[PDB]
Amino acid sequence: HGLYLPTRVTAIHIDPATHRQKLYTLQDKAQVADVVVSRWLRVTVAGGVHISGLHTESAPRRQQEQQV
Amino acid sequence: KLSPDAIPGKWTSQDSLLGMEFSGRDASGKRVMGLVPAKGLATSVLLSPDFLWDVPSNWTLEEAASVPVVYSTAYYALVVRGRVRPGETLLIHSGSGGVGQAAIAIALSLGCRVFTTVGSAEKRAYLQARFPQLDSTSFANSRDTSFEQHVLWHTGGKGVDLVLNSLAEEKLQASVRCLATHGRFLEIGKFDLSQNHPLGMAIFLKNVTFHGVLLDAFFNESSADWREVWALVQAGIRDGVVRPLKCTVFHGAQVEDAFRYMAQGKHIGKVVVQVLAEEPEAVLKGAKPKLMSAISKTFCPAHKSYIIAGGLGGFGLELAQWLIQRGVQKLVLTSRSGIRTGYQAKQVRRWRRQGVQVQVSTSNISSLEGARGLIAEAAQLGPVGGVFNLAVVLRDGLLENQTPEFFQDVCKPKYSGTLNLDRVTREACPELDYFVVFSSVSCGRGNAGQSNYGFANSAMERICEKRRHEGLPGLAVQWGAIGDVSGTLPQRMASCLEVLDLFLNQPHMVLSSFVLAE
Amino acid sequence: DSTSFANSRDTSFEQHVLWHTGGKGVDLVLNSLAEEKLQASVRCLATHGRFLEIGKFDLSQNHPLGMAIFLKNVTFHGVLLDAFFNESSADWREVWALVQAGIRDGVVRPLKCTVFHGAQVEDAFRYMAQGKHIG
Ligand SMILES: NC(=O)C1=CN([C@@H]2O[C@H](COP(=O)(O)OP(=O)(O)OC[C@H]3O[C@@H](n4cnc5c(N)ncnc54)[C@H](OP(=O)(O)O)[C@@H]3O)[C@@H](O)[C@H]2O)C=CC1
Ligand SMILES: NC(=O)C1=CN([C@@H]2O[C@H](COP(=O)(O)OP(=O)(O)OC[C@H]3O[C@@H](n4cnc5c(N)ncnc54)[C@H](OP(=O)(O)O)[C@@H]3O)[C@@H](O)[C@H]2O)C=CC1
């Protein structure tokens, strides 16, 4: 729980050609890409992007508490 | 400075993780000193016997409060991990600290020559007095990299075998260069490790075993490997190697003073907080600790069953989760339809995985038979603890376009359901401790086009007031607009749950809450 | 088994070991590979893991090592057998005893051997340099 924000990444790959090939249009006019998250392997692969070794650290809440 | 979630083991408290060690009596009356993952700063601690030592006769309870953490980490780092052998040379950073003193005590028993780093002359004098085996050439400075030269000089340039490092950044880099061939590096600090600072791998050519020492892993895992450290500490106690530290005691009321004293950083030894004074007798077989007044918050027994009507609703799902964090383990959600969205399925799957006994019901609280069936299910789970009524059916519109059917539709879940819950509770729910109905300021302040909603909410307040006139529990919360799931800004869910925690303890019958615009 | 073998010339063993280990990792790594392979092997470790390094390239070049791994109880070892010949003979007798016990207990089996005569030492060196020898 709490908002975790990225602090490190070990490897990112972007291959625009494979990206344009992976996109498939839905019944509407929208272009979509399927995504899979493997918490065992530490890879987030979607379309033509490949994030590996993401690390997120807890950030303290601003406690601005604008609501009183 | 430290995020509460950084502590290992899932707690979800976001608070009360303070405290690791304690010294006090047992459920039988025996003097014991313990080591706990968290929640050590309390008048009671629930711990397994594997993490408790008896306090010998000479020691006072105040002294025993200083031994567990420091000596366990010292033994684990040196003997269990570093495999110290008699005659070695080691550099113990921050000798004046608890872990430094414990490591010096363990090392000087084996005959090792010791280098220590201190930050002031008073600490140097204190350590000279404590450990006469130490010489005048066994002290360096812990606020600069001058200890590297000191050690590389008085060791002949060979270095040291064990380096128990607690220093960070350049001082940590400076400590590596003190290593000798076949040396071992024991890293008990966690700043550089957290930041992922780079470590040059050249140092490994000379056989070097760089260690990562974390005592926390034992408290929640690896119980088989804990017994080694426990036995080592017990042997040290019996042999006299384990000696208690200097204590600067503060009373229970002045804990903030203790925290500020620790923050200043002038203390030598350990800082202890006296919750309760020690009785002269060896074994007291006492009943309870002395009562102290403290802020009251909501917690629920494990053996009680809880009911939330319309719990698959966005407020209802969020209230259920709040209850689970407060110890509820037998829950009965009610909905006319059932699980029909991914969010509800995810939540119920998660709760059932966590061991909670969630059960969904189609029993409609409006019909008295439905209320009796719901209470029967709750009793099947366990004695009924609470009853929450978050059901709502809305038919808005100005009075010109209303009909009696609309009023009946709106009032069936809130008015009739509340009446039936009240009746079945007064009949066959003797252990009930909560009875809450969720209303809206539209009842009190008023709103246009919600006449039937206002009628439905108001009738609930009357029932709650009547219940509290006979001693039974009752409560009605007048909310504004719920945010995440009039002139009032929507109120965030976290603020809502904080307010609700505040309301469950007050003596009043009907309450209210909202956020004013601008 | 058929699931105990991965590929050494790529970094595809990290996914293999992690998958067949359930994502926990391994408890002990005997590593002799190069920079990218070495960084890959570090990520296969589990809590209380132990990294045994018997290579020299990354150590000699003083390549960096992220210290975030030691947040777990990982222990990184630098294993060199030359130090025994120069000192620590009392430490060598332990290994001598271990090898003798392995010999007498049957564990220590001899490896496959390719013989070159003294006159053809150059052929032996060339053959081992190619890289096809097994044993
Ligand atoms: N690896 C693990 O999991 C464990 C971690 N530890 C680590 O061991 C070390 C000692 O722990 P503990 O027994 O609590 O000892 P202390 O926290 O009392 O040790 C503090 C020492 O740090 C130096 N220091 C400098 N400035 C300050 C300051 N403002 N306040 C306090 N100390 C200051 C002093 O040494 P000097 O005189 O040289 O300045 C002092 O003796 C800590 O770094 C702790 O994180 C402890 C046990 C387990
Ligand atoms: N959020 C807000 O604006 C405020 C809320 N409140 C009150 O607080 C409570 C918070 O719940 P809320 O967020 O509105 O929930 P919802 O808006 O999701 O609606 C009520 C929930 O209860 C279920 N429900 C409704 N009627 C019945 C019934 N007769 N029997 C069983 N289940 C029923 C519904 O599911 P299903 O349709 O399948 O039965 C739904 O999940 C409500 O009682 C609401 O009136 C008042 C002030 C502020």
* Atom 43, ligand 1: residue with shortest CA distance: B166
Q: Pick the closest to residue B4 from A7, A54, A56, A60 (CA basis).
A: A60
Nearest by CB to residue A1, choosing from B12, B492, B515, is: B12
- How far apart CA C36 and CA C18 sit, in angstroms, is 17
Choosing among A9, A42, A45, A50, which should be mutated to test the C contact, i.e. which has the most C CBs within 10 A? A42
Strand intervals (E) in B310-369: 330-334, 357-361
* DSSP β-ladder status, B488-489 and B515-516: antiparallel
Residue B92 φ then ψ, to 5°:
-105, 105
Provide φ and ψ at B510, rounded to 5°: -110, 140
Query: CA separation (Å) from B36 to A5, B83, B491?
Result: 30, 25, 38
Q: Which residue shows structure tokens 């053959």?
A: C127
- Helix and strand numbers, DSSP H then E, in chain C: 6, 3
d(CA C97, CA C74): 28
Which residues in C lie closer than 8 A to residue A53 (C-beta atoms)? Answer: 43
B488 burial class (0-12, 13-18, 19+ CB within 10 angstroms)? middle
Distance B246 CA to ligand 1 centre (A): 15
Ligand 1, closest atom to CA B268?
A: 41
According to DSSP, the β-strands at A24-25 and B305-309 are unpaired
Which residue, among B389, B383, B379, B412, has the nearest Cα to B333 in the 3D structure? B389
Contacts by residues B80-83 (CB-CB < 8 Å, ≥ 24 positions apart): B80/B228, B80/B229, B80/B232, B81/B184, B81/B186, B81/B211, B81/B213, B81/C75, B82/B162, B82/B164, B82/B184, B82/B186, B82/B211, B83/B184
Nearest to C77 by CA among C95, C89, C65, C85: C65
Give yes or no for a contact between C25 and C45, defined as CB atoms under 8 angstroms apart: yes
Q: Are B304 and B330 in contact (CB under 8 A)?
A: yes
Cross-chain residue pair C23–A40, CB shorter than 8 Å:
yes
How many other C-beta atoms lie within 10 A of the C-beta of residue B10?
10
CB contact under 8 A, B3 and A57: yes
Ligand nearest to the CA of B310: 2
Is A47:A23 a contact under the CB 8 Å cutoff? Answer: yes
Q: Closest chain C residue to B214 measured between Cα atoms?
A: C73
Q: Classify strands B32-35 and B21-24 as parallel, antiparallel or unpaired.
A: antiparallel
φ, ψ of residue B444 in degrees (nearest 5): -85, -60
Q: How far is the CA of B394 from the centre of ligand 2 (A)?
A: 9
Residues across chain C: 135
Ligand 1 neighbourhood includes B244 CB (under 6 angstroms)? no
Instruction: For residue C61, give both structure tokens.
Output: 């070049």
> Angle B264-B268-B274 (CA atoms, 0-180°, nearest 5)?
85
The strands making up B32-35's β-sheet, listed across from edge to edge, are: B21-24, B32-35, B52-54
- The 3-state DSSP class for residue C107 equals coil
- What is the spatial distance between Cα A23 and Cα A49, in angstroms, rounded to a whole number? 12
Q: Which residues contact B253 (CB under 8 A, 6 or more apart)?
A: none
**Residue B490 CB coordination number (10 Å):** 15
What is d(CA C103, CA C98) in angstroms, rounded to the nearest whole number?
Answer: 9
In angstroms and rounded to an integer, the radius of gyration of the C-alpha atoms of chain B is: 31
Tell me the residue length of chain B.
518
Residues of A with Cβ-Cβ distance to B495 under 8 angstroms: 67
SS3 B18: coil
Question: In terms of Cα–Cα distance, which of B132, B136, B117 is closest to B178?
Answer: B117
Supply the DSSP symbol for C66.
Answer: B
- Dist. CA B253–CA B187, nearest whole Å: 36
Residue indicated by tokens 């495999």: B83
- For residue A37, report the distance from its CA to the centre of ligand 1, in Å: 40
Angle at B239 (CA atoms; ends B235, B240), nearest 5 degrees: 120
Find out whether C28 and C42 touch, Cβ atoms under 8 Å. Answer: no
Which of B85, B210, B223 is most worth mutating to test chain C (most C CB atoms within 10 A of its CB)? B210
Closest residue on chain C to A39 (Cα): C23
- Quote the CA–CA distance of B491 and B493 in Å, as a whole number: 7
CA of B166 to the centre of ligand 1 (A): 7
Q: State whether the beta carbon of B477 lies less than 6 angstroms from ligand 2.
A: no
Residue appearing with tokens 């509340």: B418
Of C71, C74, C78, the CB nearest to B205: C78
CA distances from B102 to B52, B225, B411, B473, C36 (A): 18, 21, 70, 54, 41
- Helix count and strand count (H, E) for chain B: 18, 20
B94 lines ligand 1 (CB under 6 A): yes
Chain C from 5 to 64: CB within 8 A of any A CB: 14-15, 18-19, 22-23, 43
Bridge partners, B479 (sequence order) = B440
**Dihedral sign from CA coordinates of B288, B294, B296, B300:** negative
Query: Which of helix, strand or coil describes residue C8?
Result: coil
Q: Which atom of ligand 2 lies closest to the CA of B417? A: 29
Q: In this complex, how many residue pairs, one in chain B and one in chain C, have their CB atoms less than 8 Å apart?
A: 85
Place of tokens 């030894």: B269
> In units of Å, what resolution does this entry have?
3.3
- CA C77 – CA B22 distance, rounded (Å): 36
In angstroms, the CA C44 to CA C14 distance is: 6
Tokens linked to C73: 């109880």
| CB burial of residue B396 (10 Å; 0-12, 13-18, 19+) | middle
Phi, psi of B170 (to 5 degrees): -60, -40
